[PDB]
Design a binder for this molecule. Structure first.
Ligand code: FMN
Length: 109
Protein backbone atom coordinates (compact mmCIF):
# COMPACT_ATOMS: atom_id res chain seq x y z
CA UNK A 1 0.00 0.00 0.00
CA UNK A 2 0.89 3.68 0.12
CA UNK A 3 3.74 4.74 2.38
CA UNK A 4 2.74 6.09 5.79
CA UNK A 5 4.06 6.63 9.31
CA UNK A 6 2.40 5.89 12.63
CA UNK A 7 2.79 7.38 16.13
CA UNK A 8 1.00 7.03 19.47
CA UNK A 9 0.53 9.86 21.99
CA UNK A 10 -0.46 9.35 25.63
CA UNK A 11 -3.61 11.40 26.24
CA UNK A 12 -3.52 10.82 30.01
CA UNK A 13 -0.68 13.33 30.27
CA UNK A 14 -1.94 16.86 29.62
CA UNK A 15 0.12 17.77 26.52
CA UNK A 16 -0.09 14.42 24.64
CA UNK A 17 3.58 13.31 24.52
CA UNK A 18 4.40 10.62 21.99
CA UNK A 19 5.16 7.19 23.46
CA UNK A 20 5.72 5.10 20.30
CA UNK A 21 6.66 5.89 16.71
CA UNK A 22 6.93 3.54 13.76
CA UNK A 23 10.33 3.01 12.18
CA UNK A 24 9.22 5.10 9.19
CA UNK A 25 8.35 8.15 11.29
CA UNK A 26 11.94 8.45 12.48
CA UNK A 27 13.23 7.84 8.95
CA UNK A 28 10.84 10.31 7.31
CA UNK A 29 11.47 13.22 9.69
CA UNK A 30 15.13 12.53 10.50
CA UNK A 31 14.64 12.47 14.29
CA UNK A 32 15.53 9.63 16.62
CA UNK A 33 13.58 8.15 19.53
CA UNK A 34 15.85 9.93 22.02
CA UNK A 35 14.68 13.24 20.48
CA UNK A 36 11.04 12.18 19.97
CA UNK A 37 9.73 10.02 22.82
CA UNK A 38 8.01 12.05 25.53
CA UNK A 39 7.63 15.21 23.43
CA UNK A 40 4.49 16.55 21.81
CA UNK A 41 4.37 16.25 18.02
CA UNK A 42 4.69 20.04 17.73
CA UNK A 43 8.48 19.93 17.21
CA UNK A 44 7.80 19.20 13.52
CA UNK A 45 6.19 22.59 12.82
CA UNK A 46 7.84 25.70 11.45
CA UNK A 47 7.50 29.01 9.68
CA UNK A 48 5.02 27.82 7.06
CA UNK A 49 2.82 25.59 9.23
CA UNK A 50 -0.63 27.14 8.77
CA UNK A 51 -1.79 28.24 12.25
CA UNK A 52 -5.45 27.72 11.29
CA UNK A 53 -4.93 24.01 10.58
CA UNK A 54 -2.96 23.64 13.82
CA UNK A 55 -5.97 24.99 15.71
CA UNK A 56 -8.15 22.25 14.18
CA UNK A 57 -5.85 19.63 15.70
CA UNK A 58 -5.72 21.43 19.07
CA UNK A 59 -9.51 21.71 19.17
CA UNK A 60 -10.27 18.15 18.05
CA UNK A 61 -7.85 16.91 20.71
CA UNK A 62 -9.49 18.96 23.48
CA UNK A 63 -12.95 17.84 22.35
CA UNK A 64 -11.70 14.28 21.87
CA UNK A 65 -12.79 13.86 18.24
CA UNK A 66 -10.84 12.65 15.26
CA UNK A 67 -9.50 15.13 12.73
CA UNK A 68 -7.58 15.19 9.46
CA UNK A 69 -5.36 18.10 8.40
CA UNK A 70 -2.65 19.03 5.89
CA UNK A 71 0.36 20.61 7.61
CA UNK A 72 3.80 21.87 6.62
CA UNK A 73 6.37 19.96 8.67
CA UNK A 74 10.15 20.26 8.76
CA UNK A 75 12.76 17.53 8.91
CA UNK A 76 15.65 17.61 11.36
CA UNK A 77 17.87 19.04 8.61
CA UNK A 78 15.42 21.94 8.14
CA UNK A 79 14.08 20.89 4.74
CA UNK A 80 10.26 20.90 4.56
CA UNK A 81 7.65 18.37 3.50
CA UNK A 82 3.86 18.19 3.28
CA UNK A 83 2.23 16.01 5.95
CA UNK A 84 -1.25 14.54 5.65
CA UNK A 85 -2.17 14.06 9.31
CA UNK A 86 -5.05 11.94 10.63
CA UNK A 87 -5.54 11.68 14.41
CA UNK A 88 -7.90 9.23 16.09
CA UNK A 89 -9.01 9.10 19.75
CA UNK A 90 -8.72 5.74 21.53
CA UNK A 91 -11.28 5.61 24.33
CA UNK A 92 -11.61 3.35 27.33
CA UNK A 93 -14.99 1.67 27.96
CA UNK A 94 -15.88 4.56 30.32
CA UNK A 95 -15.83 7.03 27.42
CA UNK A 96 -12.54 8.60 28.54
CA UNK A 97 -9.76 9.29 26.04
CA UNK A 98 -6.58 7.36 26.82
CA UNK A 99 -4.38 7.48 23.70
CA UNK A 100 -4.16 9.46 20.46
CA UNK A 101 -2.91 7.70 17.32
CA UNK A 102 -1.46 9.51 14.32
CA UNK A 103 -1.00 8.48 10.70
CA UNK A 104 1.30 10.80 8.74
CA UNK A 105 1.54 10.54 4.94
CA UNK A 106 4.25 12.53 3.18
CA UNK A 107 2.13 13.96 0.37
CA UNK A 108 4.76 16.21 -1.20
CA UNK A 109 4.21 14.09 -4.35
C1 FMN B 1 1.93 15.41 14.43
N1 FMN B 1 1.27 14.24 14.66
C2 FMN B 1 0.42 14.12 15.74
C3 FMN B 1 0.00 12.87 16.17
C4 FMN B 1 -0.89 12.76 17.24
C5 FMN B 1 -1.34 11.41 17.71
C6 FMN B 1 -1.35 13.91 17.87
C7 FMN B 1 -2.31 13.80 19.02
C8 FMN B 1 -0.93 15.16 17.43
C9 FMN B 1 -0.04 15.27 16.37
N2 FMN B 1 0.40 16.50 15.92
C10 FMN B 1 -0.09 17.77 16.56
C11 FMN B 1 0.61 18.26 17.83
O1 FMN B 1 0.85 17.20 18.73
C12 FMN B 1 -0.26 19.31 18.51
O2 FMN B 1 -1.48 18.72 18.90
C13 FMN B 1 -0.53 20.49 17.57
O3 FMN B 1 0.64 21.26 17.44
C14 FMN B 1 -1.65 21.40 18.06
O4 FMN B 1 -1.43 21.80 19.39
P1 FMN B 1 -0.67 23.18 19.73
O5 FMN B 1 -0.33 23.23 21.20
O6 FMN B 1 0.60 23.22 18.91
O7 FMN B 1 -1.55 24.36 19.39
C15 FMN B 1 1.25 16.54 14.83
N3 FMN B 1 1.70 17.79 14.42
C16 FMN B 1 2.59 17.87 13.38
O8 FMN B 1 2.96 18.97 12.97
N4 FMN B 1 3.02 16.71 12.76
C17 FMN B 1 2.54 15.49 13.20
O9 FMN B 1 2.98 14.47 12.68
Amino acid sequence: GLRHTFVVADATLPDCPLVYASEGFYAMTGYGPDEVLGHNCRFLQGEGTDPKEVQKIRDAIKKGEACSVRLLNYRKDGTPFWNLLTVTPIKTPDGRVSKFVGVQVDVTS
